[PDB]
Enzyme design. Sequence first.
Site, PDB file in Angstrom:
ATOM      1  N   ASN B 119       0.793  -1.196   0.000  1.00 29.59           N
ATOM      2  CA  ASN B 119       0.000   0.000   0.000  1.00 29.59           C
ATOM      3  C   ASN B 119       0.843   1.271   0.000  1.00 29.59           C
ATOM      4  O   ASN B 119       0.293   2.359   0.051  1.00 29.59           O
ATOM      5  CB  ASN B 119      -0.963   0.036   1.184  1.00 29.59           C
ATOM      6  CG  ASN B 119      -0.240   0.149   2.532  1.00 29.59           C
ATOM      7  OD1 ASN B 119       0.925  -0.231   2.642  1.00 29.59           O
ATOM      8  ND2 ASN B 119      -0.945   0.628   3.572  1.00 29.59           N
ATOM      9  N   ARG B 257      -2.991   7.335  11.356  1.00 31.12           N
ATOM     10  CA  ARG B 257      -4.011   6.828  12.254  1.00 31.12           C
ATOM     11  C   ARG B 257      -4.732   8.036  12.812  1.00 31.12           C
ATOM     12  O   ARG B 257      -4.095   9.044  13.160  1.00 31.12           O
ATOM     13  CB  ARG B 257      -3.425   5.961  13.386  1.00 31.12           C
ATOM     14  CG  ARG B 257      -2.728   4.613  12.947  1.00 31.12           C
ATOM     15  CD  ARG B 257      -3.622   3.536  12.328  1.00 31.12           C
ATOM     16  NE  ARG B 257      -4.789   3.200  13.147  1.00 31.12           N
ATOM     17  CZ  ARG B 257      -4.808   2.335  14.175  1.00 31.12           C
ATOM     18  NH1 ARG B 257      -3.716   1.677  14.567  1.00 31.12           N
ATOM     19  NH2 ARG B 257      -5.945   2.116  14.827  1.00 31.12           N
ATOM     20  N   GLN B 286     -13.434   4.334  13.422  1.00 30.05           N
ATOM     21  CA  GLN B 286     -13.357   4.037  12.008  1.00 30.05           C
ATOM     22  C   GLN B 286     -14.005   2.691  11.766  1.00 30.05           C
ATOM     23  O   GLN B 286     -13.638   1.721  12.434  1.00 30.05           O
ATOM     24  CB  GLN B 286     -11.907   3.949  11.573  1.00 30.05           C
ATOM     25  CG  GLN B 286     -11.744   3.911  10.075  1.00 30.05           C
ATOM     26  CD  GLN B 286     -10.321   4.170   9.678  1.00 30.05           C
ATOM     27  OE1 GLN B 286      -9.845   5.295   9.791  1.00 30.05           O
ATOM     28  NE2 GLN B 286      -9.620   3.130   9.255  1.00 30.05           N
TER      29      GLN B 286
END
Lengths: 351, 351
Positions: B119, B257, B286
Amino acid sequence: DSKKIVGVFYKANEYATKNPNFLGCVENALGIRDWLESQGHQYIVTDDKEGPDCELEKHIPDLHVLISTPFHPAYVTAERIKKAKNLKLLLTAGIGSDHIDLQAAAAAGLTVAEVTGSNVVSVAEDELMRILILMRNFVPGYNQVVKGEWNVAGIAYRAYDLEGKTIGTVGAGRIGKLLLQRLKPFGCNLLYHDRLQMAPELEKETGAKFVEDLNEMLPKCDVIVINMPLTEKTRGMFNKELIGKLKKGVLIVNNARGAIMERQAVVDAVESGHIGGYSGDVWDPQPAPKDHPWRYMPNQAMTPHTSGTTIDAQLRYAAGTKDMLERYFKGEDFPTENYIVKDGELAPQYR
Amino acid sequence: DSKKIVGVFYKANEYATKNPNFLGCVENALGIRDWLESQGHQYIVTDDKEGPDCELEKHIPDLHVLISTPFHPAYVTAERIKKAKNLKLLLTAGIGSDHIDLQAAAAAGLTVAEVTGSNVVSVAEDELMRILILMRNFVPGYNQVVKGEWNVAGIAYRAYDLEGKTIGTVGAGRIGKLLLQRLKPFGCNLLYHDRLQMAPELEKETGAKFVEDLNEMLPKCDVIVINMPLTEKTRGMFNKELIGKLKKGVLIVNNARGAIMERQAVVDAVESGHIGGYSGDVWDPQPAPKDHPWRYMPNQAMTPHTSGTTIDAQLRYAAGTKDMLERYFKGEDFPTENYIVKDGELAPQYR
């Protein structure tokens, strides 16, 4: 000799106080008032520029210098020129002289100049931004946020990395060059088309590959970036036929001129999905009417025409304007590249 | 030997058909069905993963391999592990194992692996995008388009070029490094802080300057990019105190985060204008509730958590997953960096 300098800018109202470096407005007036006044000049600044009764027309008869920007331009007609006893110098604090009758200015022996080259990084950045916004599908994600939504699939299905994509710039003047330089590290397949090949060193540095035939280049591109001027050749060039030849889902970025696109062809191909997305800050007409179809068409990532009026660009426009004013007062030539008309001689590119 | 492979993914519905390379969904199922079936394995794919009566639980008792992504994770509890007769291998098609009880998996002799590193470009690009979005003030411009407005001043007063700005990355692991590489050509003043200095070569190449003292670095930054993990030290680290020390108008990008920011401190400092803008795709909690205040706070350029589920990232996740499946079938070790648990041994980073 004391001169009357008139600046025409829009009123920024509270924005001018929120940012005193917002120089391109009435309230801050290019940041040159203290300096002009210290030198004994009169500096009259106004936004009121249309109509026979407007503040501008009070000063047209005896001003020496008229300054404006393309954002709230004081139109310099032959009629106004004829009324201007003292006018010598027209400065654009910015780039763009389309609001000046250049032939009338030349005939009147005027000097017309602008701050050449001062927007190029700004526009190149904004192009790169838009490439990423479109490629990575920012807009639908942002729109979910505000609507209280959370639907990853609805965003992911049209979200890609820029890495590995074929990016073609149509035109590679100063802005396209700066863009390619900024694209290099993303690891894309960079193509460019222009009247002129870049030096082989610059091509190796950016990794951009010259494509002589534009109709060969366009179908290969995941992203097309428009970086040429509006001419008889480029006007409406992205029409139904040409958009048809592009890859299905192509992303188009256009901070050059709105009319390079045929407006409805773009809407149709965006509604059909052939154009995956379209983003730019230039429109036709401009300013864009409340009803402009590009505002409401699918997948649009438009903005109003602001990329060259970032605060940093404005600082450069103000500094260039001050430089030319100082030169003007001292009887020194401006940078050659700044002249549109010089003592009544229209530069050959504007004839 | 024939294996039963279960994949758990969300349903993409029409998005799956609109983009068949949207692999991380039920409908496309990592693009591995034909291959798995050709090899005589059974491949069961479902989104129905919660409750005692769900499809997943029908297969937990005899599956060999369970695959999911962090986007619609099949939670692997000790309870479920205990019920799984044949379960050997847990794969994440993506990065993130927080939905797996690792200690239970280890105790059960399982292997847990993910597609490490896949990623990184996607997130780095997304960070760079957001830097420009915030710096150049895209969002207010976009919002005027939709609303039929045309108010350049309203956008220009907070729009800057990225060129010349001081950009600090807090952390410079793989993602921070990639980001700095992409920032280099923009002509910024790049600062980084991390536990580890980059090689002098890479510093020369990116032009990034190491700042040992984070409290020295942060006040200098026009843009701060968060690129660290959530730890006891970084949790809530951007609180009222720290936000207060940042330059007024600082722009913050956070795809790391959400909980590295103290959530309300960010809201207060955005409402006061001390934070000029905040953009990221990570949230606490989340998924972000409909009510999440970061959705509605001024100057936000948020999205749902999608930067690492671009189609290109998904292709890498699917390929990594297939590679590991093939290795599993052949009794070959996975890339070392992919293992979280190997035949019951938890990697020391995870203990």
